[PDB]
């Protein structure tokens, strides 16, 4: 088998990583690859393997995200725990243990608990706070499955997870088997400002869904990244709203939530997500970056919320790439770029049980269940878009396409690959450092 390397360890709270890393940086630059004959660090005459290995040739910094369980992997910790505890697993594989779905911050956790009781017991709920933290909670092994958009199917797929079931957005008799095409991403501008074009976005305000998503981050900042060619973005925009960025920015400054919850990427941010980004546009925004399906769902009293009750769609228009304003009903003449559907990811060993359970769960509580108020609906929410997108019909079975790259596809993986030197998500840094 392969094993991870030896590691300098130190305590967590007392520290300190930086000082050890400076000292061993000067050590590796002087003494590693025979720059000095008068002293060697990796070989010694008194004995071999002293203080370090002999076959080492240099030192690599461990990222601050990666703790020991993420360091060793999952198979190695599982094997060493079955070996300490002394259990040979038989596992005949007939029935399925209940799936531990993951939630986040008191609205997902509420809904998830209600679904845990309305199912007979096959679904149980464990909550995290941000979505990166929950993906890590799937890797080390407390949480089983999660639904998340394609920009996080890229990260979690790079960390070693597989997508199983996809979400459908189109109503059909054969929706459960047909692989859909993928939704479109647009940018919505006011009618009150008709001066906005794609050729001039500089110094004018913006609204994003969340940092790292498809329609809020990858599709905008890829096509923007060709034109600006700078990695920072709070210089190109005067100010905007993109939650999940760092607190020093103007991007977290213009956002809504309070107190201490501004720019925090959960539902406790008022401008988070699709409907929150649209509310950013309506209240304080110049351009927003959402899916194409946002405006007919927030137009005309479809929300009982007041600010969405008063609005109309013939005002709020979408702009193009060449600069020509296209009306709202035609999105296909000018979409920014396509985005793949949201998909449910899990670990590889639970793929059969997540598959068999969720196909059972979509039949009982899915889209044919009318009388939605008072009884339980799995997909209908109160436009917070929680656990699943609110307009999903069914969830498609994926055969022959279960990886991150085959699911997401070539143009999108190329797009995030163009964006890849600017992504600041620390979990991506950790899952890249694990690679040789």
């Amino acid at each position: 088998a392969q094993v991870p390397s030896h590691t300098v360890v130190a305590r967590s709270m007392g520290g300190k990583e930086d000082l050890i890393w400076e000292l061993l940086n000067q050590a590796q630059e002087h003494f590693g690859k025979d720059k000095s004959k008068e002293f060697q660090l990796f070989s010694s005459p008194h004995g071999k393997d002293l203080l370090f290995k002999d076959s080492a040739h240099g030192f690599l910094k461990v990222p601050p995200r990666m703790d020991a369980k993420m360091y060793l992997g999952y198979e190695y910790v599982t094997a060493i725990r079955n070996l300490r505890e002394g259990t040979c697993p038989e596992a005949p594989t007939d029935e399925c243990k209940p799936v531990k779905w993951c939630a986040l911050s008191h609205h997902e956790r509420l809904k998830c608990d209600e679904w845990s009781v309305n199912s007979v017991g096959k679904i149980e709920c464990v909550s995290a706070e941000t979505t990166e933290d929950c993906i890590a909670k799937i890797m080390n092994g407390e949480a089983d499955a999660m639904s998340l958009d394609g920009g996080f199917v890229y990260i979690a797929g790079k960390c070693g997870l597989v997508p199983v079931l996809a979400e459908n957005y189109n109503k059909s008799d054969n929706c459960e088997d047909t692989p859909e095409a993928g939704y479109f991403a647009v940018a919505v501008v006011k009618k009150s400002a008709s001066d906005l074009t794609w050729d001039n976005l500089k110094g004018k305000k913006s609204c994003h869904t969340a940092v790292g998503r498809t329609a809020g981050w990858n599709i905008p900042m890829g096509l923007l990244y060709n034109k600006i060619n700078h990695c920072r973005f709070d210089e190109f925009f005067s100010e905007g709203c993109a939650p999940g960025s760092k607190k020093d920015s103007s991007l977290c400054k213009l956002c809504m939530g309070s107190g201490l919850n501004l720019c925090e990427p959960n539902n406790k941010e008022g401008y988070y997500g699709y409907t929150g980004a649209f509310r950013c546009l309506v209240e304080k925004g110049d351009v927003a970056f959402v899916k194409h399906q946002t405006v007919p769902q927030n137009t005309g009293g479809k929300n009982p919320d007041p600010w969405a009750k008063n609005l109309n769609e013939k005002d709020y228009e979408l702009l193009c790439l060449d600069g020509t304003r296209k009306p709202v009903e035609e999105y296909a003449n000018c979409h920014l770029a396509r985005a793949p559907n949201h998909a449910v990811v899990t670990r590889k060993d639970k793929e059969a049980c997540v598959h068999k359970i969720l196909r059972q769960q979509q039949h009982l509580f899915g889209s044919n269940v009318t009388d939605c108020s008072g009884n339980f609906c799995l997909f209908r929410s109160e436009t917070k878009d929680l656990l699943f997108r609110d307009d999903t019909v069914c969830l498609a079975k994926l055969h022959d396409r279960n990886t991150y790259e085959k699911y997401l596809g070539e143009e999108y993986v190329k797009a995030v690959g163009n964006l890849r030197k600017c992504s600041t998500s620390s979990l991506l840094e950790a899952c890249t450092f694990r690679r040789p």
Binding site: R11, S12, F59, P436
Partner: protein, 87 residues
């Protein structure tokens, strides 16, 4: 070292390749003498040398691969492995 009350943390690793290509993982193998002529599966009753208790390429991989073939009682592990080899 991860366990409580120790609460340690891994901070600096090390690579084994050349500087042209760093490699973080390394392999675990089992060296023997020429013409000893014995298979891996029936390796009981032989002399084994381990680099330490709990170490990676010395302990966890060989006992893990040899593990389920031993009869009950398997706990504690050192008693069972001690009865597997003849010292």
């Amino acid at each position: 070292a991860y366990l409580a009350p120790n609460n340690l943390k891994p901070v600096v690793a090390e690579f084994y390749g050349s500087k042209e290509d760093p490699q973080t993982f390394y392999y675990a193998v089992a060296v023997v003498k020429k013409d000893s002529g014995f298979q891996m599966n029936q390796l009981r009753g032989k002399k084994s040398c381990h680099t330490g208790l709990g170490r990676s390429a010395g302990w966890n991989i060989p006992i893990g691969l040899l593990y389920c073939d031993l009869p009950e009682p398997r706990k504690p592990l050192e008693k069972a492995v001690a009865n597997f080899f003849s010292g």
